[PDB]
Design a protein around this ligand. Sequence first.
Ligand SMILES: *[C@@H]1O[C@H](CO)[C@@H](O[C@@H]2O[C@H](CO)[C@@H](O)[C@H](O)[C@H]2NC(C)=O)[C@H](O)[C@H]1NC(C)=O
Ligand SMILES: *[C@@H]1O[C@H](CO)[C@@H](O[C@@H]2O[C@H](CO)[C@@H](O)[C@H](O)[C@H]2NC(C)=O)[C@H](O)[C@H]1NC(C)=O
Ligand SMILES: *[C@@H]1O[C@H](CO)[C@@H](O[C@@H]2O[C@H](CO)[C@@H](O)[C@H](O)[C@H]2NC(C)=O)[C@H](O)[C@H]1NC(C)=O
Lengths: 427, 427, 427
Amino acid sequence: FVVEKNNLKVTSPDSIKGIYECAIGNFGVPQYGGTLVGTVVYPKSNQKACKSYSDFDISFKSKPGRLPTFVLIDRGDCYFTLKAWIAQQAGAAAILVADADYLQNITIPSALITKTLGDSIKSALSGGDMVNMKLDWTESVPHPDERVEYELWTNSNDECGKKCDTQIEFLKNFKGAAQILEKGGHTQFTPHYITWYCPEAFTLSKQCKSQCINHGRYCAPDPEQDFTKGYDGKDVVVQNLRQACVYRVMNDTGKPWVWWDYVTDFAIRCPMKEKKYTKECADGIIKSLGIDLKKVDKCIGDPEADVENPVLKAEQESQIGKGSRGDVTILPTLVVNNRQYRGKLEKGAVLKAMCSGFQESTEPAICLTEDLETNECLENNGGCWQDKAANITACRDTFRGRLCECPTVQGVKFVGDGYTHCKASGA
Amino acid sequence: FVVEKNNLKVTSPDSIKGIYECAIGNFGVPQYGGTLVGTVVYPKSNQKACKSYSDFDISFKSKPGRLPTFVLIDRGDCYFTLKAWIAQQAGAAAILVADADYLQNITIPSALITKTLGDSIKSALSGGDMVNMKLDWTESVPHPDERVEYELWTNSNDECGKKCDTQIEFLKNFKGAAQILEKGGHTQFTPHYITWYCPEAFTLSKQCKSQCINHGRYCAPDPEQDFTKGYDGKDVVVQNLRQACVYRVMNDTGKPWVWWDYVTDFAIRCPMKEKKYTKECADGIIKSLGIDLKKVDKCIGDPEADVENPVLKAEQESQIGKGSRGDVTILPTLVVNNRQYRGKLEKGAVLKAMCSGFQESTEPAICLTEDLETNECLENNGGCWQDKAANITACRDTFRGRLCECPTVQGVKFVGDGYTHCKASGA
Amino acid sequence: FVVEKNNLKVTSPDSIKGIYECAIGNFGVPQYGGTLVGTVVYPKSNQKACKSYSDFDISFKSKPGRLPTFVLIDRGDCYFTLKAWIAQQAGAAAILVADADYLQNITIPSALITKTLGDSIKSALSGGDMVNMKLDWTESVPHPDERVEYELWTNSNDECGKKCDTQIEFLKNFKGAAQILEKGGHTQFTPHYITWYCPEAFTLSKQCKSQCINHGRYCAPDPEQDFTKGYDGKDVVVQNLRQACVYRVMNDTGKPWVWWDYVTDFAIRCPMKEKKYTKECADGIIKSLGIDLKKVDKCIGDPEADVENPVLKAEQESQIGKGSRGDVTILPTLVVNNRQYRGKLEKGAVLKAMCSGFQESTEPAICLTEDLETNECLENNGGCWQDKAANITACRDTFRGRLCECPTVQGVKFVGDGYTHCKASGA
Ligand SMILES: *[C@@H]1O[C@H](CO)[C@@H](O[C@@H]2O[C@H](CO)[C@@H](O)[C@H](O)[C@H]2NC(C)=O)[C@H](O)[C@H]1NC(C)=O
Ligand SMILES: *[C@@H]1O[C@H](CO)[C@@H](O[C@@H]2O[C@H](CO)[C@@H](O)[C@H](O)[C@H]2NC(C)=O)[C@H](O)[C@H]1NC(C)=O
Ligand SMILES: *[C@@H]1O[C@H](CO)[C@@H](O[C@@H]2O[C@H](CO)[C@@H](O)[C@H](O)[C@H]2NC(C)=O)[C@H](O)[C@H]1NC(C)=O
């Protein structure tokens, strides 16, 4: 029963022409936003609408060019759903109510009104004035209890081998659908990372010291971080922790989907081979996306202090499956509705697995079409380089998410990184 | 039983080599266009093909490199379908017939021939001449009784608010599929518009005069046409009426799908804010698309005369649902197969709703793929600006319909409207 | 039971830290490539894992931050599948085994090890050392018995009429999916061509001499090769034979999918109207694709000698259907799993017909998405013109296969054929 004011306006009986608030039951109103104009009829008998309108020889069927009929029902003796159904049978187009099987078959809008408003219409009608109406509504937003819960156990490191390229490859291919699903209000996505604690046997180890932040509490998941690259296993732990804090901070602000733009831009902009697996590189992206560094940095804490890290401790506890899902033990792991996905990690494969969690004709568009696009360049140029003076930008929005790439203007492919400096090349 | 001449040609017994007309039963011929060459065998017994060929020790199975066998059956005593099945069992590749369950399992082409032709083959054969054949056919066109009926109740006005943008947004996204579906012969689409008549109480009203054409018979559906824009509710009624007449005129000429190119080009080219919601603007598009203005203008009539408007009167009568569909009372309303669609107004959502009205493997391509394109630029450059002297055009064909947009040539994005003037810009 | 060495490495008990070979049963390992780290526990009792671990009060459930448990099972008394299931129930994450209904419900990796290795772990453990592990695996390759068999009976000629354009049109639209399906290891595609032998009656005929290679054994399928174009029916027979030999030669080298790049490039580069239906034109493409001309030419043989042509003779024998499929008598004919396809010859239509031959969640990506691309430009520039000195190429990879088209560089559309010469145009 969603309440809006602009929904119910009163086309003139000019003495009471106005915009009133109502309460519309979710039944009888279609998925798409629409508008319904009509006029009000208040029956002299069967005013509860609990007995069948046919029994009284009352009918509401319209002639052509005639306004559809809004029946004024008084509440009592039976539910609104029955009032709406009874009215619908008699030929009503809507129902204005003043102050468990057939439910699917109710298709006329139902609105509750004030007694003070209902009385106005009744007297306006009794004087002889046509009381016309107008009833808008927006397209259906999914109920939050109906949204699919998926979760991803990933690793941010890139200097792995095949196993890390495939992961970052998935994040890039799914980013578009991931964002559309969640911005549309169909999915609760939570990313997770995996860390182990140092056994007492190897506390103050040479190994545990290059692997573990916070005095051994959280250590790098794979015991081969090829320190030859110059980056210890503990550097990975910190970077992952930053990603999780990027998520928490963005989730608290109502925009979790920005994680996808962080971890992909991190992959692009902060490579290990070029010695950019750094705080300063990550913090660059935090400016670009416009995330709160003070909050992210505070979430990360002091990875050198003999203290716990609530986020990293919660992740170690999330890895133990509760209820029916098992413990997460494989990197990566996709979980959809507290059940571990064991299929191919392809967008096509993963999307089918989730769209089965939707009810038919509650299916998001992203399930039925690839003709879609993220809407991220409308905010802050998506964090990519632009040039307001020349109307050019490096921001492009794609079925696979938002991209910062140096634009080709007047045939000239600009050269640069697209997040900070694009410029014209040569001939 | 489709009749074609070029379908049946007679590879030479040179005395009767020629191109004859036939009559092919729809059974035994596949969906795709193909060609079948063989040679004719006329059995001495079981010539009705009503008893089983096996009973007579007659068989038609071929050796390799050998031409497939065309059995010459005489009509009588049983249906063609049985003749074709009997022959098929014995090993026939086709059947030439001279002058309710197994039917699915018939897969060899069946053709009826003249007695004068059948006798020619029989004598040619009796002299000893191989009578070879060739049998072409085109891909299957859907039977018109099998096509899906959808209908859309829309509004052409644009200065509404959110509700009008979403509608015009749908027309633009669906235009490609809308056109492909109908040009392919799978859908009968009819657009509709909604108008109310002025009550006797408010005849000669100040309001009814700015809302209603034809002396009150047809009035603007929403009673807020924000006359501040300078355009009365009656201006909308006329524009909608023009759109419906664009449809009727184009439907009468066998090209209804041009409505989609009209209403989208109207949206683009005739905006209300720029004071282009005008006859002269609309008539511009009628030239571009090459529609008959004399017929469209005659359909619109004299919206100032005390007379009815058959199209607008038929629309007011179409709004009252007949049979099982209800009265259309919401703008917009999509109806598919005389049942009101109540889902999201997305292409993906709407296309699933219609492709369920097709039989499996009668499914149009547009149901199974997004790798498609309208074919509108082959006619008159789709009504967009071109430049024959430079091979450039503003016409582009898209999965979302035909677009007139100023081309980027040698890297130079041309500037203009793409329907009437494109030109080179600056540096 | 796939055997790899790099799959099983032993995170340190430093005295036995190393990379050992194993044998992983296909059960309990997901579709996606992943990695699993844990530590080994060797139970003192129930070491066959044949009785239920619960009966002994043995459990493997982990605390958080704790490494997942690898149970060391001794083989005997029951199958690995039961050992893995029993262990899984008790809370194991994997199983190390030393030296017909519930099977679906087994989800922990199972690996077999050497007795010499199993003993090492046992003694290492008995001294007190944590024996940790690491277990990688790649994404699942489909078993070759599970792949779909489709076959196409086509014609290479182009100067037909509508029937030949539609065929070449299909080859071009399907080439992308055709290649992806087969390179991914989901389909065995074999192309076929159709030829008839000259009847003794018309041996040494005027007609049979312009139609048939190898002294009449193999003749052009349609008896109208419009010799007005200058190309006899026997020229078509030879060109088709070359295509089939291109397939055989490429199939023998493990790259059959190159046929698709041959027959489409033949269509583009060797047209009949421009008198390019020549050996020298075809041999040009054989260089481009880098096919072995010596093998292809030897497969074609001497189409003028009184001899058989094994490939053309095998094709005439393949046309006679064996088992349940009929004789192929229509051009074109698509067969999927020894059953003749009778639907529309559209990619969308054809792909549904094949993806039904896959088990759910064994579905290739190409079945669930159009966001795909051939990977052909990584090899030899796909056979298209390039210019290494300028980083430009004519090779582009598409959902519809690999394309050689002259690139547009700095806004300048280059002009040429894209296989051999691209060059800058004018202004
Ligand atoms: C991310 O934000 C959401 C909502 O802001 C959080 O979800 C809530 O979690 C609490 C604690 O379990 C529940 O009682 C609420 O019902 C949840 N609200 C929802 C699901 O809308 C979520 O915990 C946040 N943090 C994450 C996901 O790590
Ligand atoms: C648009 O054109 C079609 C065909 O030209 C019209 O459809 C015919 O309508 C008459 C009257 O109801 C029927 O008897 C015919 O069977 C219809 N032919 C068909 C469906 O092929 C249609 O009425 C025209 N006008 C519209 C749709 O407004
Ligand atoms: C193309 O190559 C494949 C494999 O190299 C050939 O398939 C083999 O054919 C033999 C003979 O029938 C079988 O015994 C094998 O089991 C097949 N191997 C497979 C299917 O992997 C095939 O014959 C070759 N030639 C074609 C398809 O014309």
